[PDB]
């Protein structure tokens, strides 16, 4: 196409870009590294993320997106522009149409900030789409049908729970407790339990390697090691963590997620709840990969929980795909 159609999952942790007719063309951490004094852009993406917790005073590794929205506008803009340009494979004579995912609980001010960023970033037209909706579309769930589709989307910034029907969200809950809060909980557990200071990236690695929320011998037996500073001696220290401890460290976050799902179901229209019981709950998002999360939610809700086939790319895919679905596109907020 001359005018590209782009779908963007601008996450607090990772940014995915879908290009209609090509697929996912961008999959990089939502991090930008700059020279702390001049403001020169040093790196964007993976090379920038690799700097987190390891930068000299002359470099600042920034994650402009937080809680599913723009935390630092000027930096978010530069990052967004970089990713869009990269998605287009170089500037074209015609500015692309762009759809960006947003949390349902986003405010009008936060919405406008993203629309403006999109236009300044080079889009001819920008549209905003709720993440769970994009996630459902990207997963080929027939969102336009009058059939209850409950999606639990856990990203890095927010946990979104929505019951979808007729191309729209009927009931929902949006909490700013997700992937980032999980890493944070691990960092905190280690500090409090062992008086050892570890970084955000080490905590994330632990989450990925042995993160789990359902008790089982298998999960309890999972183990890995973390390295940091023993705050009692000031000496470097390596220690082993087992699944049981990580599950406990994640208890509060899980409780909050379980509660958001339970709360949404309770206020969902009965006919839709009837559909959900038959259809099951769809679990997706990068933050939903915790071991036994589907098992836990199924036990807590009494309803079958099905994991997304492509939990990381669903939102970007849907955002791109909606550009070819007029009936849904028509209802999205836009600018340009």
User: Would the annotation count 251 as a binding residue?
Assistant: no
DSSP structure class, residue 212? B
User: Would the annotation count 242 as a binding residue?
Assistant: no
User: Would the annotation count 12 as a binding residue?
Assistant: yes
User: Would the annotation count 204 as a binding residue?
Assistant: yes
Q: Is 247 exposed, middle or buried (0-12, 13-18, 19+ CB in 10 A)?
A: buried
User: Would the annotation count 117 as a binding residue?
Assistant: no
User: Would the annotation count 156 as a binding residue?
Assistant: yes
User: Would the annotation count 205 as a binding residue?
Assistant: yes
Q: Nearest Cα to 284, choosing from 175, 138, 169, 181?
A: 138
User: Would the annotation count 193 as a binding residue?
Assistant: no
User: Would the annotation count 207 as a binding residue?
Assistant: yes
Buried residues in 176-214 as b, exposed as e (16+ CB within 10 A) = bbbbbbbbbbbbebbeeebebebbeebbbbbbeebbbbb
Q: How far apart are CA 159 and CA 178, in angstroms?
A: 5
User: Would the annotation count 289 as a binding residue?
Assistant: yes
User: Would the annotation count 144 as a binding residue?
Assistant: no
Q: How far apart are CA 148 and CA 277, in angstroms?
A: 9
Contacts of residue 97, defined as CB under 8 A and 6 or more positions apart, other chains included, come to 3, 4, 5, 6, 123, 124, 125, 126, 127, 323
C-alpha neighbours within 13 Å on the C-beta side of residue 64: 25
Q: Where are the alpha helices (DSSP H) in 121-178?
A: 131-138
Phi, psi of 26 (to 5 degrees): -145, 130
User: Would the annotation count 58 as a binding residue?
Assistant: no
Give me 186's structure tokens: 């691990």
User: Would the annotation count 334 as a binding residue?
Assistant: no
Q: How far apart are CA 336 and CA 334, in angstroms?
A: 7
Contact 196, 237 (CB under 8 A): yes
User: Would the annotation count 157 as a binding residue?
Assistant: yes
Question: Which residues are part of a known binding site?
Answer: 12-14, 156-158, 204-207, 286-289
Can you say which residues are annotated as belonging to the binding site for ATP? 12-14, 156-158, 204-207, 286-289
């Amino acid at each position: 196409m001359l005018r590209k159609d782009i779908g963007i999952d601008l996450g607090t942790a990772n940014t995915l870009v879908f290009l209609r007719g090509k697929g996912i063309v961008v999959n990089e951490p939502s991090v930008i590294a700059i020279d702390s004094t001049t403001g020169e852009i040093l790196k964007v993406g993976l090379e920038a993320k690799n700097m987190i917790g390891k930068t000299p005073a002359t470099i600042k590794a920034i994650r402009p997106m937080r809680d599913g929205v723009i935390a630092d506008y000027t930096v978010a803009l530069v990052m967004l522009r970089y990713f869009i340009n990269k998605a287009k494979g170089g500037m074209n004579l015609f500015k692309p149409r762009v759809v960006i995912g947003v949390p349902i609980g986003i405010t009008d001010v936060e919405r406008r900030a993203i629309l403006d960023a999109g236009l300044e970033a080079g889009a001819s037209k920008v549209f905003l789409i709720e993440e769970p909706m994009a996630a459902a579309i990207g997963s080929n769930l027939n969102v336009e049908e009058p059939s209850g589709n409950m999606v639990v989307d856990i990203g890095g910034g927010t946990t979104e729970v929505a019951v979808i029907s007729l191309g729209s969200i009927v009931t929902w809950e949006s909490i700013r407790i997700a992937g980032d809060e999980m890493d944070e909980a691990i960092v905190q557990y280690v500090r409090e339990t062992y008086r050892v200071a570890i970084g955000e990236r080490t905590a994330e690695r632990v989450k990925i390697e042995i993160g789990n929320v359902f008790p089982s011998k298998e999960n309890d037996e999972l183990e890995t090691t973390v390295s940091g500073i023993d705050l009692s001696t000031g000496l470097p220290r390596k220690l082993t963590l087992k699944g049981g401890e990580v599950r406990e460290a994640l208890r509060s976050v899980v409780v909050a997620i379980v509660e958001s799902v339970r709360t949404t179901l309770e206020k969902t229209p009965p006919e839709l709840v009837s559909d959900i019981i038959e259809r099951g709950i769809f679990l997706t998002g990068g933050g939903s990969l915790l071991r036994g999360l589907d098992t836990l939610l199924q036990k807590e809700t009494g309803i079958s929980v099905i994991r997304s086939e492509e939990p990381l790319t669903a939102v970007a895919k849907g955002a791109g795909m909606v550009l070819d679905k007029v009936n849904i596109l028509k209802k999205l907020q836009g600018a340009g």
